[PDB]
Design an enzyme around this catalytic site. Structure first.
Site, PDB file in Angstrom:
ATOM      1  N   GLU B  43      -0.253   6.477 -10.615  1.00  0.00           N
ATOM      2  CA  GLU B  43      -0.237   6.544  -9.071  1.00  0.00           C
ATOM      3  C   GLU B  43      -0.173   8.096  -8.935  1.00  0.00           C
ATOM      4  O   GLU B  43       0.693   9.019  -9.660  1.00  0.00           O
ATOM      5  CB  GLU B  43       1.044   5.893  -8.598  1.00  0.00           C
ATOM      6  N   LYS B 109      -2.411   1.815  -0.753  1.00  0.00           N
ATOM      7  CA  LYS B 109      -1.369   0.943  -1.177  1.00  0.00           C
ATOM      8  C   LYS B 109      -0.803   0.257   0.127  1.00  0.00           C
ATOM      9  O   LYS B 109      -0.657   0.995   1.247  1.00  0.00           O
ATOM     10  CB  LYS B 109      -0.279   2.188  -1.434  1.00  0.00           C
ATOM     11  N   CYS B 143       2.075   0.543  -7.747  1.00  0.00           N
ATOM     12  CA  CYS B 143       3.642   0.960  -7.862  1.00  0.00           C
ATOM     13  C   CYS B 143       4.433  -0.041  -7.130  1.00  0.00           C
ATOM     14  O   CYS B 143       4.686  -1.226  -7.822  1.00  0.00           O
ATOM     15  CB  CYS B 143       4.097   2.395  -7.334  1.00  0.00           C
TER      16      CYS B 143
END
Ligand code: CAC
Ligand code: CAC
Lengths: 265, 265
Positions: B43, B109, B143
């Site tokens: 990431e 995300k 994540c």
């Protein structure tokens, strides 16, 4: 709330012997009187996990329902476990929740264990059960249910305003040792993702279907770390879980606020 | 489909240095040309995970997007990782999926890392990305997304008829070592519950704010068992995952048939 005392009763369920199991589990429970708030037994703790047990399944007016009520009163603790139970609507794998205040609630296992052919003749549940005991809100589920994170999910601002749905999730099980890794891993994952304690009881010993069970009963904290874990042998342990620690974790790590809204079909 | 070759690129991301990172990761990628089908970077692999990095964030016309397309062509592999990326809406943590032919898909995300204050200034995504590559359907996430099982859920008979949504789920991350246990546990749980391979890359080293990262990048099979796992040091490993083994498991353990229908809100 206050802290909660939980007893894990990791027994070797007698095969197809309801009366024998009431005696056996009764004997295991006896010393817990006054010492626990929540006593957790395995799934199908009167017959073992058995498809043939369907044809002799008790009903709600039967001796096992009476026995669990008796045990809750005798111990001064909530008692939970599952039994094959016949109703007008079929025979369910029914988790019983008996409290010493004289209340009885239940949850019919939603996900019948397809791999063990439980789905062939048993009836499936639908609704999720959340109960309140000693200021703790608790979601009891059964064995295979563990593999279904959406149904296990601890939602925010749904069942309780501005709060997670529950504080403690439970699983009662006959989970064979060949797949113990999945059991251990999923229990830990549920506690982490749901920001809650998880308590789980699995039987030990060998059953009539030749399956071996390793136990791995545990109380798992909100970080996914087992506070107590027991294995292999018949064993009872009682442990206390901290309301304060849970509340602090939920404040410190507010992942509750980021959960996605969804509707179950 | 054939078997897929996956390269984990566990780098020590240079703090606030996009050009340095393109050079650094470029050098790690050089030996992979012809050896891999899918190369996975951490990431925010150009800046490090940083709230300050928002002001100078690149756009889709920037050098990093050009660089990743160039790498895909040079290596003959799909390349993935995320970058802070500015659009008309704001700045996203955008995972890029670049293939040798020059095609590009992306995923913003969905769950911004609240504990690290990512949600204060960055924009959140909504859509889930699934891509087809070498006959594999792949769901790349980022994540913190890992903590959200409903958004991570491999549904049955929804995206693909009579099949699960995807075959391989990926997570790219900057997950601090203080919470490594959660990372490791959740990756394994996702593979188990979603009956799929999981591949995950986390950085190593210490970032500009003195946070330590242990890596624990891995390729984990559909039983939750790692096939390769790497930690602590800067490291690249390439491993092959078995299409047939996945199919056999899904045929043998039909848990896909028991998943619950739901609709995201
Ligand atoms: C594995 As079970 C008995 O549900
Ligand atoms: C832990 As992450 C940065 O989301």
């Amino acid at each position: 709330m206050h802290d909660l005392r939980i007893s894990l009763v990791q027994g070797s369920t007698r095969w197809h012997d309801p009366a024998g199991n009431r005696d056996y589990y009764g004997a295991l429970l006896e010393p817990l009187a006054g010492q626990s708030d929540l006593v957790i037994l395995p799934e199908t703790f009167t017959s073992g996990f058995s498809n043939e047990a369907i044809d002799k399944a008790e009903d709600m007016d039967g001796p096992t329902v009476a026995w669990i009520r008796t045990q809750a009163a005798r111990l001064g603790a909530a008692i939970t476990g599952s039994v094959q139970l016949r109703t007008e609507h079929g025979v369910f794998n029914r988790l019983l929740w008996a409290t010493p205040d004289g209340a009885l609630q239940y949850y019919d296992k939603r996900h019948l264990f397809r791999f063990g052919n439980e789905h062939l003749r048993y009836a499936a549940g639908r609704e999720r059960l959340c109960v309140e005991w000693k200021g703790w809100r608790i979601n009891p589920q059964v064995c295979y249910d563990l593999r279904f994170p959406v149904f296990c999910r601890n939602r925010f601002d749904v069942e309780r305003p501005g709060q997670l749905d529950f504080d403690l999730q439970l699983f009662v099980a006959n989970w064979p040792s060949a797949r113990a890794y999945a059991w251990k891993t999923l229990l830990r994952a549920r506690a982490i993702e749901n920001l809650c304690f998880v308590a789980a009881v699995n039987r030990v010993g060998v059953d009539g279907n030749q399956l071996h069970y390793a136990g791995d009963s545990a109380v798992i904290d909100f970080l996914g770390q087992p506070q107590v874990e027991i294995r292999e042998q018949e064993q009872v342990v009682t442990t206390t879980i901290s309301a304060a620690a849970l509340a602090e974790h939920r404040a410190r790590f507010p992942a509750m606020l980021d959960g996605d809204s969804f509707v179950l079909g």
